[PDB]
C-alpha cells in the first residue's frame, strides 16, 4: 500500500527495497505500466520527446552561456592556435592554494576549466564574433526550450492530444521529415552560411541588423532565376585568405573546390554551403515521395508488398513471401522503429566521428589536437551505445512485439527460420578474426622479445591502400583511377579534383593517413570486435523468443534473471544477456579503435610517426609506447612536489579505476552471498540498543540479479569512459597545451 | 576566488545551492514521496 511507484501496482505492494530500485528502472518502460493503452502510450512518448528536446536545448543554452559569460571568446578569436578555450569557471570550496594556482589558466584570473568539446571553433566558424552574439544565442535557445516545454505540456491536454491514427501516419511523417526536418533545415543552414558565416569569414559583419541590407553576392538573386548559376562560383576565395578578415577574401558564396582552407586547415565555408544546398534540394525532392492527401505519391505497403522476386527471376522466391506483413509489423511495434532509428543514428554517428577528423569543418580545429581527440572518442563511444541499443531493441521487438502470424514466411520470419545459421557463421568469423589477430600479435611479441623483429609477420594493407590510391593518393604508386592523371575518372569534368588531390597528397592533415603493417592488425582487431559484438547481439536478438534450452523465453519477457539451476544451469539466458555481455565487447572494441586513433594521431601530431609504425605490430609496443609512455604526465598531475593543471585528470583517472573495479564486485560476486550478509546486518540493527528505535519502512534486501548485472555494467561503463577520457585529455593536453 | 567575469558572486550562491541545498530538498521530498503509504 505504497504510492510509489504509481505506474506499477505489482511493485507498489513490494515490502522491500526492490520497490524503489525497480520503480526507478521501469519508469520509462511505458508499455508495462498498469492501465496503459496504446493511445495513451504514444501521447506520453510524444510529450517525453518534447521534454527531451527541451533538455537538449537547455544543455546547448548552458554551453553557449558559459562560453559567453565566463569563457574567453574575445581573446580566443585573436589567437585560436595559442589561446586555450575556457569552458566555465570553477567554484570549489575544497581547493587549496595549489589548486587555485594550478587551475588559474588560459589567461584568466580565476580557476577555470579548459574547454575540450571545441564549440569555440564551431562558433567562430558559423559566424559568432563577440560574447553578445553568444548571449543572444543562449537566450534564444532558452526561449526555444521553453517553447518545446509548452508544446509538450499542450499535447498532454485532451484538446490537443493526437489520435492514434496521427501517430501511425508514416507517410506524412516521412514527407515532413525529409522535406522539412532534413531539407528545409539544411536550406536554412545554407541561408545562414551564405548570409552570416561566409561574410563573417571575409571580415564583413552582418548581424540581425544588416542581413536585409548586406547582399550576400554582388549579383544578388539575379543569376538564381535566370539560370546562369556559375556567377556564384566566379571569384572563389584565394589560397592567401586569412579567416575573419577581408584580405585575400573572395566574393563567391558557392564555390566547389573540394579542398582545404590553407590557414584554418578546414573545409571551405562556401563548399559547406554548396553541399548543404545540394542535399537540401535532394532531401526536399525525397520528401515529395509518399502520398498524404493529394493522391499522387507512394504508399509504403504497396512498395513493400511489390518487392518480392517472382518466379522466373534468377533468385526466384528466395525471400519467401518477401516484405508483406511489414508496415504493420514496423508501424505497430515502437521497438522496431526505435531499433531502426538507433542503428541509423549509430552508423551516422560513426560517420560523424570518422569524417570530422579527416575532413574538419571548423576553423583552426585541426590544430587543436585535444579537441579532435575528445570529439572522435566522444562520438565513437556514443555510436557504440546507439548500435548496441539498436540491437537491444531488436531483441525487445522479438520478445514482446513480434507476431509470427502477421510475419508469415516473410523476410523477418525467414530470419528466425535460419536464426542460428547466422549465429554459427558469425561465431566462425569471430573465431577466424580472433585466433589469427591474437596469433600474429603474440607471434610479433615473441619474436620482438627474442631480439628478432624482422621475423614479424608484417602485412601491408594493400586493399585499403588501393582504396586510398583510388581516392587520389600517389604515395603507394598504384596509378589507379585517380592517382594517374590519364584515367577516365581523372580526365572527367570533376572540378573538385584540384583541391582534393593536393588535400589528400599533403601530409599536413588527417585526410587519408598513411597506413602500414600496424594498421592491418588493428583493423582486424576492430573487425573482430564488431563481429563478436554483433555475435552477442544477433545471438540474443534471434534467441529472444526462445530456443532449445528455454522454449518459452517470451513468457518471462525481455529481462529476467534465470530459469533456475535446473536443466543444467541457466545463468544469463534472457535476451538482456545480449545487451549485458555486448556492452563489454562494445567497450572493448571502442577501446581498441580509440587507442588506435589516439596513438596514430599522437605519432602524427608529435611528428614522430615511426613509433606507431614500428611498435604497433606487437602488443608490448602498445602497452609501453602508448599506455606507459603517455600516462607519465597524467599520473604526475599531482605529486608530493606540487599540483599541475592535470590534477583533476589524474583524479578522474583514479576515479575511473575505482568505479571500474567496483563494477567487478557486482559482476563477479552474486546475490545470495549479499542477501546472507544483509540478514546478519539486519540482525545486528534489530538487536543493538538505541538503534533499534530506527526501523526501516521497507525491508533491506540485496540487489536483484538483473539489477546487479546492470549496476556492475553501469560501473564498468562509467569507469571505462571516465578513465579513458581522463587519460586521453591529459595525454594529449600535457603535450599540446 | 571571485572571477573577472560579470556577476562573480553568483557562483558563490548557486553552486552551494545546487550542490548542497536543492539536493537535500530533492532527497527529502523524494523520500517523503517514495515512503508515504496509500
Amino acid at each position: 500500500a505504497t504510492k510509489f511507484p504509481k505506474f506499477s501496482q505489482d511493485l507498489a505492494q513490494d515490502p522491500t527495497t526492490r520497490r524503489i530500485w525497480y520503480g526507478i528502472a521501469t519508469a520509462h518502460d511505458f508499455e508495462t505500466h498498469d492501465g496503459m493503452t496504446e493511445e495513451n502510450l504514444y501521447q506520453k512518448i510524444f510529450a517525453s520527446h518534447f521534454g527531451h528536446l527541451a533538455i537538449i536545448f537547455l544543455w546547448t543554452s548552458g554551453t553557449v552561456f558559459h562560453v559567453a559569460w565566463q569563457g574567453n571568446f574575445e581573446q580566443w578569436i585573436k589567437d585560436p592556435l595559442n589561446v586555450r578555450p575556457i569552458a566555465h569557471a570553477i567554484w570549489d570550496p575544497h581547493f587549496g592554494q595549489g589548486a587555485v594556482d594550478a587551475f588559474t589558466q588560459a589567461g584568466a584570473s580565476s580557476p577555470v576549466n579548459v574547454a575540450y568539446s571545441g564549440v569555440y571553433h564551431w562558433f567562430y566558424t558559423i559566424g559568432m564574433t563577440n560574447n553578445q552574439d553568444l548571449y543572444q544565442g543562449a537566450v534564444f535557445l532558452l526561449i526555444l526550450s521553453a517553447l518545446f516545454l509548452f508544446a509538450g505540456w499542450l499535447h498532454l491536454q485532451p484538446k490537443f492530444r493526437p489520435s492514434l491514427s496521427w501517430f501511425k501516419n508514416a507517410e506524412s511523417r516521412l514527407n515532413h521529415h525529409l522535406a522539412g526536418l532534413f531539407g528545409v533545415s539544411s536550406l536554412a543552414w545554407t541561408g545562414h552560411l551564405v548570409h552570416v558565416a561566409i561574410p563573417e569569414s571575409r571580415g564583413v559583419h552582418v548581424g540581425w541588423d544588416n542581413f536585409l541590407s548586406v547582399k550576400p553576392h554582388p549579383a544578388g538573386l539575379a543569376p538564381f532565376f535566370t539560370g546562369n548559376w556559375g556567377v556564384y562560383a566566379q571569384n572563389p576565395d584565394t589560397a592567401s585568405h586569412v579567416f575573419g578578415t577581408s584580405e585575400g577574401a573572395g566574393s563567391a558564396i558557392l564555390t566547389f573546390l573540394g579542398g582545404f582552407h590553407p590557414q584554418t586547415e578546414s573545409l571551405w565555408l562556401t563548399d559547406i554551403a554548396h553541399h548543404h544546398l545540394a542535399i537540401a534540394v535532394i532531401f526536399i525532392v525525397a520528401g515529395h515521395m509518399y502520398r498524404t492527401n493529394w493522391g499522387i505519391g507512394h504508399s509504403i505497403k504497396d512498395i513493400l508488398a511489390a518487392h518480392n522476386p517472382p518466379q522466373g527471376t534468377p533468385f526466384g522466391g528466395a525471400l519467401g513471401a518477401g516484405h508483406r506483413g511489414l508496415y504493420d509489423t514496423i508501424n505497430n511495434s515502437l521497438h522496431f522503429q526505435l531499433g531502426l532509428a538507433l542503428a541509423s543514428l549509430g552508423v551516422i554517428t560513426s560517420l560523424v566521428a570518422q569524417h570530422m577528423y579527416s575532413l574538419p569543418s571548423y576553423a583552426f580545429i585541426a590544430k587543436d589536437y585535444t579537441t579532435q581527440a575528445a570529439l572522435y572518442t566522444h562520438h565513437q563511444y556514443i555510436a557504440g551505445f546507439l548500435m548496441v541499443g539498436a540491437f537491444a531493441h531488436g531483441a525487445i521487438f522479438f520478445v514482446r512485439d513480434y507476431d509470427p502470424e502477421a510475419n508469415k514466411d516473410n523476410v523477418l520470419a525467414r530470419m528466425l527460420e535460419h536464426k542460428e545459421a547466422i549465429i554459427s557463421h558469425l561465431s566462425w568469423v569471430s573465431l577466424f578474426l580472433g585466433f589469427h589477430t591474437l596469433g600474429l600479435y603474440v607471434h610479433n611479441d615473441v619474436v620482438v622479445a627474442f631480439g628478432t623483429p624482422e621475423k614479424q609477420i608484417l602485412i601491408e594493407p594493400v586493399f585499403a591502400q588501393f582504396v586510398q590510391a583510388a581516392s587520389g593518393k600517389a604515395l603507394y604508386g598504384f596509378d589507379a583511377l585517380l592517382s594517374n592523371p590519364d584515367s577516365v575518372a581523372s580526365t572527367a569534368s570533376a572540378v573538385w579534383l584540384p583541391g582534393w588531390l593536393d588535400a589528400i597528397n599533403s601530409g599536413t592533415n588527417s585526410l587519408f593517413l598513411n597506413i602500414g603493417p600496424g594498421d592491418f592488425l588493428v583493423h582486424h582487431a576492430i573487425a573482430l570486435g564488431l563481429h563478436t559484438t554483433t555475435l552477442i547481439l544477433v545471438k540474443g536478438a534471434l534467441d529472444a523468443r526462445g530456443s532449445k534450452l528455454m522454449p518459452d523465453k517470451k513468457d518471462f519477457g525481455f529481462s529476467f534473471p534465470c530459469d533456475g539451476p535446473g536443466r543444467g544451469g541457466t545463468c544469463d539466458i534472457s535476451a538482456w544477456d545480449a545487451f549485458y555481455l555486448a556492452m563489454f565487447w562494445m567497450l572493448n572494441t571502442l577501446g581498441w579503435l580509440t587507442f588506435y586513433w589516439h596513438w596514430k594521431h599522437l605519432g602524427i601530431w608529435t611528428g614522430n610517426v615511426a613509433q606507431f609504425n614500428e611498435n604497433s605490430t606487437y602488443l608490448m609496443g602498445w602497452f609501453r609506447d602508448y599506455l606507459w609512455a603517455n600516462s607519465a604526465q597524467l599520473i604526475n598531475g599531482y605529486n608530493p612536489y606540487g599540483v599541475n593543471n592535470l590534477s583533476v585528470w589524474a583524479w578522474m583517472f583514479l576515479f575511473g579505476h575505482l568505479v571500474w573495479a567496483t563494477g567487478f564486485m557486482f559482476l563477479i560476486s552474486w546475490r545470495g552471498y549479499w542477501q546472507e550478509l544483509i540478514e546478519t546486518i539486519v540482525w545486528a540493527h534489530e538487536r543493538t540498543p538505541l538503534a533499534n528505535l530506527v526501523r526501516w519502512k521497507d525491508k533491506p534486501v540485496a540487489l536483484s540479479i538483473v539489477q546487479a548485472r546492470l549496476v556492475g555494467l553501469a560501473h564498468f561503463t562509467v569507469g571505462y569512459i571516465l578513465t579513458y577520457a581522463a587519460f586521453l585529455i591529459a595525454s594529449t593536453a600535457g603535450k599540446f597545451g | 576566488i571571485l572571477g573577472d567575469f560579470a556577476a562573480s558572486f553568483l557562483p558563490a550562491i548557486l553552486v552551494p545551492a545546487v550542490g548542497l541545498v536543492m539536493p537535500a530538498v530533492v532527497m527529502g521530498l523524494l523520500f517523503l514521496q517514495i515512503e508515504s503509504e496509500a
Binding site: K6, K44, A47, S48, F50, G51, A54, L58, F65, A68, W69, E74, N131, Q132, Y135, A138, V139, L142, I143, S145, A146, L149, F150, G152, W153, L156, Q157 | F5, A6, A7, L10
Partner: peptide, 30 residues
C-alpha cells in the same frame, strides 16, 4: 564581455523554462 545585468536577465528568462518544466513533469506524471 557580457554585462552583470545580462546574467540576471538570462536567469529570469530561464525561469520561463523553469516553470514550464515543472508544469510538463506534473502532467507527464498524470
Amino acid at each position: 564581455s557580457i554585462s552583470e545585468t545580462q546574467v540576471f536577465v538570462a536567469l529570469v528568462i530561464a525561469l520561463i523554462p523553469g516553470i514550464l518544466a515543472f508544469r510538463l513533469a506534473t502532467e507527464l506524471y498524470k
